[PDB]
Amino acid sequence: RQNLKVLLLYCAFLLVMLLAYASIFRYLMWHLEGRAYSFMAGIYWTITVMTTLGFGDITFESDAGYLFASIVTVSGVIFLLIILPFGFVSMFLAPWIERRLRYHPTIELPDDTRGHILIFGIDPITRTLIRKLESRNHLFVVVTDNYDQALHLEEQEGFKVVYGSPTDAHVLAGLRVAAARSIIANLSDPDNANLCLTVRSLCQTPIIAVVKEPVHGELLRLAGANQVVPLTRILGRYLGIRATTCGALAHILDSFGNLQIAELPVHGTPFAGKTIGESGIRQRTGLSIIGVWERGSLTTPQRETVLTEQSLLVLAGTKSQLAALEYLIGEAPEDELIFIIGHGRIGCAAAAFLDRKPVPFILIDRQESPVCNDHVVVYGDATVGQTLRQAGIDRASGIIVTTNDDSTNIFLTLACRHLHSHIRIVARANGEENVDQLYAAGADFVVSNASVGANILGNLLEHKESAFLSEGMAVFRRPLPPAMAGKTIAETRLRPLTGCSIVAIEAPDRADILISPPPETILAEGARLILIGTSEQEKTFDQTIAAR
Amino acid sequence: QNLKVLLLYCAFLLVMLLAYASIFRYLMWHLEGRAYSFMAGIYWTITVMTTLGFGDITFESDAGYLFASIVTVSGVIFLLIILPFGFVSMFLAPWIERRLRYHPTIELPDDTRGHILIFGIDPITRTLIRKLESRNHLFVVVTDNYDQALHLEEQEGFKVVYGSPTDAHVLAGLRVAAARSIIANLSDPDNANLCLTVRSLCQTPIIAVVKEPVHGELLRLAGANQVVPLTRILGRYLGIRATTEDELIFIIGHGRIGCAAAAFLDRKPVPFILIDRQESPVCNDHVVVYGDATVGQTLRQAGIDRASGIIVTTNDDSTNIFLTLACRHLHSHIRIVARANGEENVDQLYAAGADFVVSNASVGANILGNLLEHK
Amino acid sequence: QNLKVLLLYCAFLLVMLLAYASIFRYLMWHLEGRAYSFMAGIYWTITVMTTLGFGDITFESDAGYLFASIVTVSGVIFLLIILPFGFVSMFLAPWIERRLRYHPTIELPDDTRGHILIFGIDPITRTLIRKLESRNHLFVVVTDNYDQALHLEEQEGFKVVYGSPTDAHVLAGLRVAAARSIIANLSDPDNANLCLTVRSLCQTPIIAVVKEPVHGELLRLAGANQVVPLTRILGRYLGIRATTEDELIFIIGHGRIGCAAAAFLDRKPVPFILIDRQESPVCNDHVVVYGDATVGQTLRQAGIDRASGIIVTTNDDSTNIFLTLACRHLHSHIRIVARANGEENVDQLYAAGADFVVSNASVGANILGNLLEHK
Amino acid sequence: RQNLKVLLLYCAFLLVMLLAYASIFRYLMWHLEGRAYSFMAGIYWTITVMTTLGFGDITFESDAGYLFASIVTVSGVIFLLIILPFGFVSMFLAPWIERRLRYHPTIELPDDTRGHILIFGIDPITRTLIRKLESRNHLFVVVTDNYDQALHLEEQEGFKVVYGSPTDAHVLAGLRVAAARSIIANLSDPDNANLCLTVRSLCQTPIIAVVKEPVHGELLRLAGANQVVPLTRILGRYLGIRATTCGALAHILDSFGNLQIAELPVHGTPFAGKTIGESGIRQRTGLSIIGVWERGSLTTPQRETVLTEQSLLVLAGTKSQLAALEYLIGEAPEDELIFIIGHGRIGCAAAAFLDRKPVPFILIDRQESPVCNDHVVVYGDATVGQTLRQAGIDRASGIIVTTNDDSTNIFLTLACRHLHSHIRIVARANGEENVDQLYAAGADFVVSNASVGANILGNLLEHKESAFLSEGMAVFRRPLPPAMAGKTIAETRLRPLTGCSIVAIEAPDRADILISPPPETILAEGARLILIGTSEQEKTFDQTIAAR
Ligand SMILES: [Ca+2]
Ligand SMILES: [Ca+2]
Ligand SMILES: [Ca+2]
Ligand SMILES: [Ca+2]
Ligand SMILES: [K+]
Ligand SMILES: [K+]
Ligand SMILES: [K+]
Ligand SMILES: [K+]
Ligand SMILES: [K+]
Ligand SMILES: [K+]
Ligand SMILES: [Zn+2]
Ligand SMILES: [Zn+2]
Ligand SMILES: [Zn+2]
Ligand SMILES: [Zn+2]
């Protein structure tokens, strides 16, 4: 842009210089020496002089003609010999060298820039959220106050990088935060607080803050943030659920008090190896298989679907419906004891989780946690010798390996699995490049940080048409009224009446479900509906069915 | 400088021109018997050196060949090598050489007078500069830190010099004698060194910002014309804002300021609690409640409930904000006074819930600024 | 690459030449009725583009003027801009661009086979390289450390790649499948990661240098074809050299080696004293006498007098030298075995008084080297 | 050198190309078209073609002539249009940019380099030894293994800088250590040991090692070093001598057992304010004023010389002669108590000194000395408040301020002198740029590290014709034999007879001395000689006087 324009702007000047001279010449030849020259001769002459070719076939004779020739000559040397080779070189050669040779840190965004997604605080999660959602070519812009880090992210991108204080309002003004589509506040909690209060001072643009300590959750909504994600606590959960010898029930959401969305690791459970229709999970409980999570993907349930031990079943149903699956697994193993190696915010979160549903564990680390005063820790280097065995890794029913270094995690998983082939080992993979290797070391399940993080933010980013809608709302299930047996969702006109929206229609006699049905969907008899609206829209719903 | 070297070389070139154009007209006459008009001589000489080469005006004698060969090369050496080099070197070097690698300015020009020497850059001084360059005073900051001279050179509005502020030779190059005023905002021992050294070269007025108020008379002693105990003052402004029985003021942060503020609330007896993480390396006369205020029930275990005032005094604004935000959530009616190092965060401490905010940079600049034009 | 782009552009230029020289001869004939020999066409075309401009062969019709104007510019664009650029860009860029700022090599060519991947550079491997490039094997070292890739790139004899040795995509670019052998000389957890990852891409032989000998079977388990417990071995070589009653051997230095050596002198019961400064982060089974050996009567308070042998095992050669020098001064007849990390200091440990010197780099290279060509 | 040669080598080729072409042309014109051209025409043509001037007055006509013209044309564009502008630019423009833009670290010395002085371990002392002895333009070469430090020393020099391991023998080989004049080993003691053992492996070049811990002195001579300087211990001495309220006697050398070279701070002594002849120091004791040290300079004593309080008197005489000056000062003040603020190697050395001649002191510091277990230290920050007064700085007779930071030293000296105007304050100046300011703060005397260091090394460097001669020798004084009353030193021919050398001849009845007398010096009656030879040369001396 700014360099190419300067180029052919200067070419327009040169062509003007040409056409001018070629005519001044034809004038002089006529008015000085009495020679009528064709126009092309004027061009041909002028070119020949400036370019310093100088054929000498067309020359002047009067001193006056000498002067104008001398002039045109120099004008060739100044503008075709100096500037034009300079400009061709300066606009082409400078970018390759000046910008690799020394950083020219981008400090501001263009005036017109809109629709971008501001990333504040780069790390494995966000870096993975970027590589994943640039598959829709969103304009991802990351920001850093760290000069040497802006260097790295500028040479390898994918995403434009800005260098500056994320709290300085003037900086945020140059980032056109008002015209932004969404802002990801992935800094420290006090910086996240500063960040939000500052953005709320310039605009109202949606801010998804990733909070470290879950207690600071309400404090960041308070700082302005539209949605808060306690990632460290969540990953701890996913670890504690994966470690419980027999796959246990995990509660995801309490939609008012009507419906519970939950999940279940199929491992060590009578549904493992068995299929969906074979297990007949919906039939015996009345539950709703809203989706199955196997190989890092969200898929719709099928009857012919075999549940691997590695699988995770999402659920939806009443409190007495979930209860029916805590008995269809369904007995706890005697002498449970889970080693949690690593007392980060995650290992601590996981230990807080295994506390919530009482399973005794041992927290092993090297130094004491700067954050936690409520967890007793066994102190000692796990890498060095008999440390795990002195704690008694022998009577353990599960090892959760939670170091912030993947290479170490691998080496423990490798060390444990060698030492005990049959025990449940759950590891944690910061960088998702090491996921495959924790499995290959012997991990029964691997929780990739980057992957789980990106998936949450990603979903919260493209659901951001109704994510703050979904926030502060209740989701419910309604047995489809027989009056609408055979009628379209569109023909029924449910949303203009009630305000609720259909997200899923399952079969009357099947574990199969149709999720996010199109407006042209013809309803069926007995088909069980599951919708999302306000608490009060679930309410006025029952009329607009009775009304019409 | 670089421009002078350019058109000095253009004067030489025009001399070369007028000379050659006349040597030519001489030769044509004295070698081959051709009288050429002066303009023809210029026109020829230009045509040769510029290597255009029309060939309408040529010599014939071997002698004429020689002078033509000479004028030809002189064109290639001075219009083909130097003049494109010089146009490129004076224009292209500054954009690249100076962004690409630092050429640290080590000295001030001979004639430089009326400048205001800044020694020890920080939020205060940086704010004193943006504020008093609205009268376009020549602000010159100095640092012994190479990597810091880099930052301040690319972003300016003030020229930056790299060198030891205590080395007398350095101060001599800074023309301290002809200076209008000197701001000594370093450590107390450095400030002392700085003054004793300037008093050795001149008598130029020196406004020293003293950290520990006891060292105040020691710096006037080092030469300083006026001494400003900024940390003590900001503590005062905090203690005054927090009172305005069962009075009880939490002071979160035991810096020199929170300690100054606690020393202030002592002077007019109001009971307070000093909360911090580590013990103050400077104070042995204030009892401190030790514990991280960010982590959980720390403030409540001290009893933030029967408190009539919280003074939030961390040296990090983002943390101050997050406390003010945390306190005001926890207690809507109590007087919360916060402190804003960088004045970019002032608005946000208010927005968090601060009943009053004391901006360091702002209060500092205002004092120095006033002391500078009242000088 | 860069050379190809050059004479590819020369082929285009010669095409431009032969084309123009014929278009010209055509025009002269079809425009003005002048038959020109082919060489005249070349000679003209050269003369125009090169901007020489003799003016002996010129057109007269406006049409001829146009084609001449065209050929003229085509000379200025392709002989005046690109050809001097390209000669400069392919020649001048490598000397400057690559010394001036690093362009870190991130990947290996498609066809690269028969190479020996080095993972984890240090005195041993660096010595294994200088020794086995006497058969001109393609040694490629890898590092995730940017500033270390710089050093190893300017001083080589081995190509350097910058990247995570555990990232599978990185290993894919290194053509690990077509590799001849891989040397895993990282930490034990990294070595484990490294192997499990290579075993995921290929089955290429991996010689892992294991630090703690207990992790030996764990690395064969990670895939490694052969495991070398170098630290344990060097300890052995030290313990053997120090015996060869009242036998009593001082082992100065409680590294993995001095600890290995002490474990060795345990296996065939000879009483010793382990002297160090801090406690070993790895060993809880060796009692150590704590105290700085450099500072005064430390060795004599332990009783270096009734000792039958000193094993000097510091990870600094200059210190080892200074101890060996200090001991041999203090006791001429006692058996002193020292350890030489860098083999540049071997001669000096002898010269200080070492009865035998165990060079780390040398013993390491010899083992790996043998394991590499016996492979 | 290497770049200029490549330039005019290429100019020789160009002129060859010229003279060749100009003759090929004249040949062709004759053998192709039948035109005899003068030689100058050939040059003139050839120039005109290659330079792309192209007058077109002299052209060919045959196709053959076209070819050779086309050839000469291109040869102009390749060698006058590409290389010659490149080479003019590359040899001129590269040094200014390539070398400022990125370091090209000098890794080796030229083959022929001899007579240089290798500096190993740059610091205030050596940097001052360099600025001082480049006033004789010696080739000072400093060496460092620190890349970022080689950068600094290369841009500011004065002295060429080499980058490499000073212990690596190959490195030392490139430094041509064999052809070296002298080597200064100013590294750590183990590095100094390594350095010497390595140099002794390549050559025998003289090595002056600056030893930190004085106990390691004999260990470095053992490593090869020809002379060892325990600088830290010496500076401690100079501090302890300066602090003793009344100027005390300090013993410099025990030449066998015959003669003692000593010194005396004149401060607080009855010679202060008084002159040399007025005090009549030589007269009452028999001592020899070998030189006076006032303002950082070594000067010959004069009778009309006033001894300031700041002065230091060097001495030479027997054990009973020095004794006579420990009573002419001469009484110790009651209640002596010296604060030594700073427990470095120097403050510790100074405290070890004030121990040797029992004066009670207080060692104050912040942390405990990693090196000393024999000095009890009062721990506490001296900058912070009542720390000095709680130790009782009130009953102190002297403060020695010995921090490794000058700005702090200044601030203490400034703080003490404020607190106590009359007490003896001795400070220490690392960098000699701060010396003036310690005085201006109130220091009664300032010991500049850099200055005292350079002066020792400097002297040891230019005395290196007889420094190792002076080492292991004894210096003596002899009452000039009356037989040589009126005879020259040269006429006497003392050195070929005895082997001793005259360094000083003083007057029979004067405190004045003539030092390093020229060979043409006519002796006098009673004039007292002081010479330097071997222990055994002082012996055989008494014959060669009795012989003739
Ligand atoms: Ca991996
Ligand atoms: Ca802000
Ligand atoms: Ca060596
Ligand atoms: Ca100074
Ligand atoms: K012509
Ligand atoms: K003609
Ligand atoms: K021409
Ligand atoms: K021409
Ligand atoms: K030309
Ligand atoms: K040109
Ligand atoms: Zn915890
Ligand atoms: Zn305090
Ligand atoms: Zn051990
Ligand atoms: Zn001591």
Numbering used by the authors:
A (entry chain B), D (entry chain B): 17 to 564
B (entry chain A), C (entry chain A): 18 to 261, 350 to 480
Paper text:
Each GsuK subunit contains two tandem RCK domains, reminiscent of Slo K+ channels. We demonstrate that GsuK is a nucleotide-activated and Ca2+-deactivated K+ channel and reveal the structural mechanism of multi-ligand gating of this double-RCK K+ channel and a distinct pore opening mechanics. Ca2+ stabilizes the closed gating ring by binding at the inter-subunit assembly interfaces and deactivates the GsuK channel. While both NAD+ and ADP anchor their adenine rings at the same site on RCK2 by using the conserved nucleotide binding motif, they utilize different functional groups and activate the channel at different sites.
Two full-length channel structures, wild-type channel and L97D mutant, were determined at 3.7 Å and 2.6 Å, respectively. First, instead of forming a single straight helix, the long inner helix of GsuK is segmented into three parts, labeled TM2A, 2B and 2C, respectively. Second, rather than forming a bundle crossing right below the central cavity as seen in the closed KcsA structure, the four inner helices of GsuK are more parallel to the central pore axis and generate an elongated, water-filled vestibule that spans twice the length of the KcsA cavity. Despite the similar gating ring structures, the ion conduction pores of the wild-type and L97D mutant channels exhibit obvious differences along the inner helix. As shown in the pore superimposition, the inner helices of the wild-type and mutant channels diverge at the glycine gating hinge (Gly92), but converge at the C-terminal end of the inner helix where the bundle crossing forms. In the L97D mutant, a noticeable helix bend occurs at Gly92 (hinge 1), whereas a sharp turn occurs between TM2B and 2C (hinge 2) in the wild-type channel inner helix. Although the intracellular gates of both the wild-type and L97D mutant channels are closed in the structures, the structural difference between their ion conduction pores suggests a distinct pore opening mechanism for GsuK. The wild-type channel exhibits cooperative Ca2+ deactivation with a K1/2 of 197 μM and Hill coefficient of 2.3. GsuK has its intracellular gate at the end of the inner helix, distal from the canonical bundle crossing seen in KcsA, allowing for direct coupling to the gating ring through the extended linker.
